[PDB]
Amino acid sequence: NLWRSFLYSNVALYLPDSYKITPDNITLPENKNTYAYMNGRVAVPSALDTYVNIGARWSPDPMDNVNPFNHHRNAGLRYRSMLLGNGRYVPFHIQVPQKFFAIKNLLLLPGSYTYEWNFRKDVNMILQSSLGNDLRVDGASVRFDSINLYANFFPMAHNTASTLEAMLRNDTNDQSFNDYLCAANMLYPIPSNATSVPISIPSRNWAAFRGWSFTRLKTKETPSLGSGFDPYFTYSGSVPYLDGTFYLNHTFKKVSIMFDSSVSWPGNDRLLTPNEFEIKRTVDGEGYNVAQCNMTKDWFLIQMLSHYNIGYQGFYVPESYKDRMYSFFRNFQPMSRQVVNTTTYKEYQNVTLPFQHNNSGFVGYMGPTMREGQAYPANYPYPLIGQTAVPSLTQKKFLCDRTMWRIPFSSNFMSMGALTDLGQNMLYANSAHALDMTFEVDPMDEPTLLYVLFEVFDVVRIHQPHRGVIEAVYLRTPFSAG
């Protein structure tokens, strides 16, 4: 019984708006993404009640698309949203960091410095709802009172604080540092059951760089980050593009990369299918299934390696200091099933969801209701076990959220520093030639958009030649700004 409510009120209540049939005699608002609409959508218990995929580890079919980050048992949201108070009216007093990189770690030398930012007091982006609604339609207006800057000055002694300031104003002593995840993003709109898109950016010097990170995310959950104000931002919760929280990460069918529309990459038949970074094989073949899911051997070899240099010397469990939270390996978990055969079992005759009955006169019919019906035997599932012995066939798809696929721009795909030998191979030439990418992808009901990081060097450099001036000579090679 308490396992049942752990399946109704935790997973079965999170089906998308195809399911969750509205009950009778209560009318619901039109807007479809308020809380006034998502309160009355009553999920059916008799879909994944307690008997679904029984004794397996299978996430159900419409759980491919919903994140576990709109979740009301989100243990971060258990902590953040109650650190304020349990009520509608909260006089918060919070402290934001300085998280832009190039003036974060920059130690500042003596003078006088005009310093500005600006704060996003629209209410959809400042807040993270769990279930997500039109958070400004319901009316949740945050207002600001008086906004400051606390600063901690180290009490450095005057024999040294006047020595160091005359030391960090040379050319060669200056401050210069990267951005972690040095990259450029290029986010592409792959519309709503489009099974594949092509991609081009034309004809640039690929001077020195390493790695391509790329993932998928729903266009309902992206900002229009260019404009300050943003209309149309319907859903306000657990935005992947900002939170580092990717969950359509596993819905790439086949990925391929072609420089110049002629030459493949890596070429030379290094990988087994060199015109192909196949990533989820949906056919048997002659065996390309790492770890009992459908991830292939050609791509697990360069998604176990590129984070850890595992691979050619054993497929051992990676070290815990290298295994982080946003790593690939910690979240990659396979699955399986035994779905009933629709062909061989001659007595197979499927039952539509209003007519499947377990706990026949011990449940409600449609939605959680009182006692009705009569005690009686069951229909679904067909028993996969034992003397009954229905013929079966398996299913082998995975999900690896929370991280990004990475293709290191290398010869042997090895992370061997900032540069790569094949990264700085093009400076030995002078080519500046284009690429095309085509991403075969899982079709979906929602318009969805495709994210690409060209993980390209992002280096700033500052020095203060006098008391008060500060100049910031930037560089990004390639994908520059001038």
């Binding site: 019984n1 308490l2 409510s5 006169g361 011990f362 009182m370 006692r371 009705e372 019906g373 005690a375």
Partner: protein
């Protein structure tokens, strides 16, 4: 739910059809044929709270 799924097993004195009126079947044993009426005599816990 009660022990057995039985709320009020009233004897419903079995009968077999015949044209425009019907009576007196052989094999129904009229003093015993008990079913319920409505639903199960069910009472409720909120075992989560």
């Amino acid at each position: 739910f009660p022990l057995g799924g039985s709320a009020a097993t009233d004897t419903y004195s079995g009968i077999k059809a015949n044209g425009q009126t019907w009576t007196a079947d052989d094999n129904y044993a009229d003093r015993g044929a008990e079913i319920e009426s409505g639903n199960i005599f069910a009472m409720e816990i909120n075992l989560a709270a």
